[model samples]
Target: HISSQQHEKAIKSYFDEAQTQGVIIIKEGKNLSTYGNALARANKEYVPASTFKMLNALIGLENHKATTNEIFKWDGKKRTYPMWEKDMTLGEAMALSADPVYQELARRTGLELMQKEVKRVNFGNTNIGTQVDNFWLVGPLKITPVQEVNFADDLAHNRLPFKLETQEEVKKMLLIKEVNGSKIYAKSGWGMGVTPQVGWLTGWVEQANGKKIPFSLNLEMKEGMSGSIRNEITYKSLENLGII
Candidate 1:
């Protein structure tokens, strides 16, 4: 079941069969588990949205490109690039899904450090590309479901391919936050769009049981997308999955 054409009907059908199809389930540690279509969907690669920011923050802290404490000013000055709004923190960048902050971060860090960090996450299918900023820029970098599993495993074991010190610093940055007693922490991306609408919401969710589920999800739609709709679906989905 592809969960086709109709949002109401399709969304219901998708969820009803998701667990059996392997689209929904708890993440296993450092190992592959059974899944059918769900696993396939999980393994299916798509453009990682703001989800890449965690890695951006990780690499920045590790490589000394920037610190979570460091601040960048974005006064009323016009942005050098095109966008709706401007100015943000590394943390705010991740939370708010601001592209400019990330784009600029890439320019500062240089390509090598970002590339190294991208691979270190161990998501085999994830490719940050030669243009360092592309990780944040979106496109050119993609991650399959299977690779997401691998990266989550690395995060769990603190096994990034970079130096041990770098790895340690990164783990420190990937922390969990409870908002109003709900387990929530994530990074989402909204792109210009292609077929099925190009966008992504990827990050870790701390289950109510204190279990960690780090995932990269896509909430694509027809050409005209809806942030409010997707946001409603995601938070509801998280609640249903016992994330709160």
Candidate 2:
């Protein structure tokens, strides 16, 4: 409980340091803990952007659309970002935020099974519109930081109605970094289509003792905000709370 002071300070300081407003919520196992305009942003829904990848990976694996090491070949066509141009596995697509690769996976996942699993997952508002792809990134589908954390918690605890093996496979996809007996698993997201371009990083920390601290953060991003800044603030916040 005493870390509350530092958590609060880190929330305010990190967001202020970035000169934006957002909410940071941690599922502390017993209760939901948060700081930084909790009432305003925690429950507010926003376009999930690439952060939806966590669920996307699960959908792909569960529906037999993509394998854990399935290679998504890069078409010769050039796309939005150069980094996304190379051929890569599903994990690489996730790492590079390759839009078209997952878009293709969604095509394979199709509307019927996609909607069925999304409904079963009960993600956010459960409004997955008609289009199979771009629903999460472009419009209609949305989720709040609160729901994001809840999803992580359920995924972490094997409470979601997915195959235990599939859940474990997808869980491995979220790992971004590891050190000091702590593993940080998250998917970063940038919503370009939305007004103000919200940014997100949602997942959890697995400590050595098997304890998990699921967390979600989303902030209003400035125009042309550098993609890496979110991680800087996130690691700082986690460090302040001594979670990493």
Candidate 3:
């Protein structure tokens, strides 16, 4: 509710000092922020990794191949099938980020149906360039941070082109919490193939008053094994940037 001078300062300050490969920050119906080489260094088509698991779950539900209520089994015991696994509930599977559950879900949904679901999500500039069965869950599907922000916005609006009845289940998977009247839902992705490490956080923070005034942010950084650090940096940054 201020003037143009304040707005210009915020935008200019960020552009002048931001690091990382990519950054996409939006607020109150404005682009408010942006920085970095986005898909730089990584394959212009870097794989999406587990972030796509959300879609995997969505497709499984849409195809009648899986249900949120049914338990799949996370036996805690090591698998005999090498990359194979114990068991899991579709809900627990998503919570635990289980690759096996999604692999099976993919197997049941089949490649065609999975592709169709992704198309409906409208994740532009992405190439799901891996076999769904292989469960090579990391870095095969390429996506840009900017596109991640777009996906977040659409998911918040429920106008994502694809009609899905599993919004409740999916919401359970993504909604973290509400803060200062903002409803935040998100998914994060990470991988360590072509390089030592790559990771990203993408999601939207929506106003709780039933308005479309949601902010979307997508970011990626090169890091070692510290999801805790990632989480800390992300939320702190979000709050500092007026996301919450």
Q: List TM-score per model, in order.
A: 0.69, 0.95, 0.74
lDDT of all predictions:
0.54, 0.84, 0.58
Against the true structure, candidate 3 has what lDDT? Answer: 0.58
Residue 188's lDDT within candidate 3 is: 68
For model 1, name the residue pairs that clash: 22-38, 23-38, 42-145, 43-145, 43-146, 49-189, 50-188, 50-189
| Residue-by-residue lDDT tens digits, candidate 2, 1-244 | 6567766876688888778887788888858877664448988899989988888888898878889887888888988988888888888888787889889988899988888888888998888899998898777899988999898888888888889998899887778988699999888999988887888988899999999998888888888578777887777777777888
**Model 3 lDDT tens row, 1-244:** 7454654454434423444444444535545355333423222444566567767776788678978887776556686344346556776666556777777788888777766766666664444545766533453456655555555666666656545567656767877667788776777666656463556556666665665433333334454345543454455555555556
For model 3, the superposed segments whose C-alpha errors exceed 4 Å read: 1-22, 27-32, 35-45, 75-87, 134-140, 211-223
lDDT by residue (40-106, candidate 1, tens digit) is 5665666665567666766676667777666666656566444425555576555555666777777
**Ranking of models by lDDT:** 2, 3, 1
Error of 2 at 92 (Å): 1.0
Could you arrange the candidates by TM-score from highest to lowest?
A: 2, 3, 1
lDDT score of residue 63 within candidate 1? 69
